[PDB]
């Protein structure tokens, strides 16, 4: 909801702040294109520095839910 | 050397897959029947809230009610067969 929260400056929290300052603030019409553009960067940061990694990551290789198998 | 790398068709039994199933086996498998229902517009795909609960899968194109793959055959086999292949000329497909 955009309320301030003090948090320890963990790598995940710094990613949270960066996304707050570069992705989340943007308007709704502008959020989808920027997510598409920075998909690779966002996935890399989620996998490296955030508690919720990108799901479609198989043995470290960033992938997609449509590009990964059932196993 | 020339190789047929790909192929397809639009015919009285839908695509090449459905036509081949009807040609060889004389009937549609589950996959062939679902492809024919999708081709004929009997079943459409729905994903999201439907009657409150979230539904993902095939629905009836007209009634929008959920239809399971197992029931696709029991619900649309007769219509697919009646309105596929060699049949009485339908004026609605040739402008009255």
């Amino acid at each position: 909801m955009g309320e301030p929260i003090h948090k320890i400056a963990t790598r995940g929290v710094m990613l949270w702040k960066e996304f707050d300052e570069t992705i989340f603030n943007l308007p709704k019409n502008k959020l989808v294109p920027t997510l598409e553009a920075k998909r690779d960067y966002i996935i890399s940061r989620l996998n490296a520095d955030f508690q919720k990694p990108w799901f479609a990551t198989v043995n470290g290789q960033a992938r997609d839910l449509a590009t990964m198998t059932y196993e | 050397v020339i190789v047929v790398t790909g192929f397809a068709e639009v015919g009285p039994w839908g695509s090449a897959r459905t036509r081949w199933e009807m040609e060889a086996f004389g009937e549609f498998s589950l996959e062939g029947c679902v492809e024919m229902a999708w081709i004929m517009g009997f079943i459409s795909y729905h994903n999201g809230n439907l009657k409150g609960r979230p539904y993902t899968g095939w629905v009836d194109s007209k009634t929008k009610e959920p239809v399971d793959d197992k029931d696709v055959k029991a619900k649309y086999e007769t219509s697919i067969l009646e309105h596929s292949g060699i049949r009485l000329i339908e004026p609605e497909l040739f402008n009255g």
Binding site: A66, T67 | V1, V3, V4, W38, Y45, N47
Partner: protein, 48 residues
């Protein structure tokens, strides 16, 4: 209009005997990847 025509289609596997082991293997790997991608595209496009 007297349009006679004849084509002959041979089994695809007679082609693969004209190439090496390595070339066939790399070709097979590339068709496997392409088959997966094409399945993805076909089903997505079917539903949507």
């Amino acid at each position: 209009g007297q349009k006679g025509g004849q084509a002959i289609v041979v089994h695809p596997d007679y082609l693969y005997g004209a190439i090496t082991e390595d070339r066939y293997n790399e070709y097979v790997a590339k068709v496997s990847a392409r088959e997966k991608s094409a399945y993805k595209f076909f089903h997505n496009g079917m539903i949507y």
